Amino acid sequence: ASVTDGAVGVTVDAPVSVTAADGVLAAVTMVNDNGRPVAGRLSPDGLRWSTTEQLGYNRRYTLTRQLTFQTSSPAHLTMPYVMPGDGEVVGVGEPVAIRFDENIADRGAAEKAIKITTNPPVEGAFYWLNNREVRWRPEHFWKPGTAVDVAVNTYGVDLGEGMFGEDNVQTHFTIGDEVIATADDNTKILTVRVNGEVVKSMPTSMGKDSTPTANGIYIVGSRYKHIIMDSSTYGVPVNSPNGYRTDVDWATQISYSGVFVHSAPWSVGAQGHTNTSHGCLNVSPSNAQWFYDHVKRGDIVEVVNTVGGTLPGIDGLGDWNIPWDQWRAGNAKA
Ligand SMILES: [Ca+2]
C-alpha cells in the first residue's frame, strides 16, 4: 500500500510498490493516463510488485484494494547536464560535474538523486562550486584505468521551492594514465611526468611579481589551437594597467580565472629565467603544441614555489585545493 486512493502530488522518482503479509498475489496492475498506456511489466518474487516503467508528470493512474491517484504537477523544471562526456577518457584529476540550469534550493535532494559507481570502488563525496554546479571526487587522484558510471536520477525529484528535475541523464567514462606536470618557480621548468616518470621538460615564464601565478593544483580543462586572450573576460579591463588582448597559439586552460599553458614566442629568452606574464605559463611554440597534443582533460598541473598565494578551491578547476575533510563534509547541509 505505497500510495493512498485519492492521493495527489504522488512523486514519480520512486516506484509504486504493493505489499502482502500474510498472503500472496495476484493479479496486480496499473493503468494508464495519457493515453491509457498500461503498467510497468510487473515483478518478482513472493510478496511484492513494483513498477518498471517510470511515471509522467500530471497523470491519473489506477491500481483486495483499488487505488486511484495523481502525480506531481511541478511549478518549475530544471535540466541537469553531466560531465565528463559519455565514452570519454579523462585524466586523474577529473571530478564528476553535474550542472543544473537553475539554482538548486535543496542540495541534499539533488545529491541523493545522483548515483555514482566506480570500478575499482573508491570513496568520494560531493561539493558545490556554486548554486548550479556540484562536483564529486575521491580523496586522492583517481587510479588510472578506473571506470565510472554516473546516473543523475533527477526525474520526479523535488529539488525544493516547487522545482523538479526535468529528466535523467547518465555518463560512463574512464580514467587514463596519470599525467602530472609540475611548474616549479625554483627552476622555471615545467616537468611532465607519466605514472611518476619524466617524459618532457619545458622552460617556462610564469606570472611576474605583481601578477604572479598562484601555487596549487590545477585541473586541465579545454584546449584551443588559437585563441584571443582578453583580460576583460576575467574581470580586468583591457585598457587598465594589468589588462591585455593577446592572440595565442596552442592554449590549454588550467583555471577559470584565466591561467593557460600556451605558446609565447615573445618570452622565449625569459623562459627558464624570468617571470614576465600576467599569470599564464608561457612556453615555447613547440612545447606548447606538444602540451596541447599530449595533455588531456583532467590531467594535472601543479604550480609550486611562486611568490603568489594559492588557487581558490572554487575557481572551477581548483577542486583539489580544498582539503579532504572539508570537501567530504560538503556544503549541501550544515
Ligand atoms: Ca526549466
C-alpha cell at 325: 575533510
| Cell 491509457 -> residue | 36
Report the distance separating Cα 194 and Cα 176, nearest Å: 10
The verdict on 308 and 196 lying in the same domain is yes
Look up residue 103 and give its amino acid: N
State the DSSP string of 11-53: -SSS---EE-SS--------EETTT--B------SSSEE---S
Q: Residue 81 forms beta bridges with which residues?
A: 99
Q: Pairing state of beta strands 60-62 and 31-32?
A: antiparallel
Q: Are 193 and 295 in contact (CB under 8 A)?
A: no
Q: Give 164 Cα–ligand 1 centroid separation in angstroms.
A: 9
Domains identified in the chain, total number: 3
Q: Are 84 and 171 in contact (CB under 8 A)?
A: yes
Q: Give 107 Cα–ligand 1 centroid separation in angstroms.
A: 17
On whether 316 is known to bind a ligand per the annotation, the reply is: no
Q: Residue 229 forms beta bridges with which residues?
A: 246
Q: Are 332 and 107 in contact (CB under 8 A)?
A: yes
Q: Which helix (H) or strand (E) holds 302?
A: strand 300-304
On whether 244 is known to bind a ligand per the annotation, the reply is: yes
On whether 162 is known to bind a ligand per the annotation, the reply is: yes
Q: Give 151 Cα–ligand 1 centroid separation in angstroms.
A: 20
Look up residue 262 and give its amino acid: H
The verdict on 21 and 141 lying in the same domain is no
| Cell 543544473 -> residue | 100
| Cell 586523474 -> residue | 92
Long-range pairs of 54-57 with CB within 8 A, sequence gap ≥ 24: 54/12, 54/155, 54/156, 55/12, 55/16, 55/156, 56/12, 57/12, 57/156, 57/164
Indicate the Cα dihedral angle 99, 101, 103, 105, nearest 10°.
-80
Q: Give 100 Cα–ligand 1 centroid separation in angstroms.
A: 10
Question: Which of 38, 72, 106 lies at the terminal end of a domain, its last residue?
Answer: 72
The verdict on 206 and 288 lying in the same domain is yes
Report the distance separating Cα 246 and Cα 94, nearest Å: 29
Q: Pairing state of beta strands 147-152 and 114-119?
A: antiparallel
For the domain that residue 119 is a member of, what is the CATH number? Answer: 2.60.40.3710
User: Taking Cα atoms as reference points, which of 23, 142, 14 lies closest to residue 72?
Assistant: 14
Q: Which helix (H) or strand (E) holds 193?
A: strand 189-194
Q: Are 39 and 51 in contact (CB under 8 A)?
A: yes
Q: Pairing state of beta strands 300-304 and 216-219?
A: antiparallel
Q: Give 79 Cα–ligand 1 centroid separation in angstroms.
A: 7
C-alpha cell at 289: 603544441
For the domain that residue 238 is a member of, what is the CATH number? Answer: 2.40.440.10
The verdict on 155 and 226 lying in the same domain is no
Strand order across the 31-32 sheet:
31-32, 60-62, 68-70
On whether 313 is known to bind a ligand per the annotation, the reply is: no
The verdict on 199 and 273 lying in the same domain is yes
Q: Are 99 and 154 in contact (CB under 8 A)?
A: no
Report the distance separating Cα 313 and Cα 329, nearest Å: 15
Buried b / exposed e over 121-158, threshold 16 CB at 10 Å, is eeebbbbbbeebbbbbbbeebbeeebebebbbbbbbbb
Residue 260, CA distances (Å) to 81, 104, 213, 257 in order: 25, 31, 10, 10
Question: Which of 19, 51, 72 lies at the terminal end of a domain, its last residue?
Answer: 72
On whether 101 is known to bind a ligand per the annotation, the reply is: no
Report the distance separating Cα 332 and Cα 66, nearest Å: 40
- Check whether the bond before 106 is cis (ω within 30° of 0): no
The verdict on 261 and 306 lying in the same domain is yes
Domain of residue 153, residue span? 73-176+319-334
Cβ within 8 Å of residue 302, ≥6 positions away:
180, 181, 182, 183, 216, 217, 218
Question: Which of 50, 72, 94 lies at the terminal end of a domain, its last residue?
Answer: 72
Coil vs helix vs strand at 288 = helix
The verdict on 126 and 199 lying in the same domain is no
- Check whether the bond before 101 is cis (ω within 30° of 0): no
The verdict on 28 and 1 lying in the same domain is yes
The verdict on 55 and 149 lying in the same domain is no
On whether 302 is known to bind a ligand per the annotation, the reply is: no
The verdict on 325 and 289 lying in the same domain is no
The verdict on 273 and 300 lying in the same domain is yes
Q: What is the DSSP letter of 75?
A: S
Catalytic residues: 262, 280
The verdict on 183 and 309 lying in the same domain is yes
- Check whether the bond before 120 is cis (ω within 30° of 0): yes
Ligand 1 (ion): residues with CB under 5 Å are 77
Strand order across the 169-175 sheet:
89-90, 169-175, 147-152, 114-119
User: Taking Cα atoms as reference points, which of 224, 203, 204 lies closest to residue 282?
Assistant: 204
Coil vs helix vs strand at 61 = strand
Q: What is the DSSP letter of 123?
A: -
Q: Give 210 Cα–ligand 1 centroid separation in angstroms.
A: 44
Strand order across the 133-138 sheet:
80-83, 96-100, 133-138, 124-128
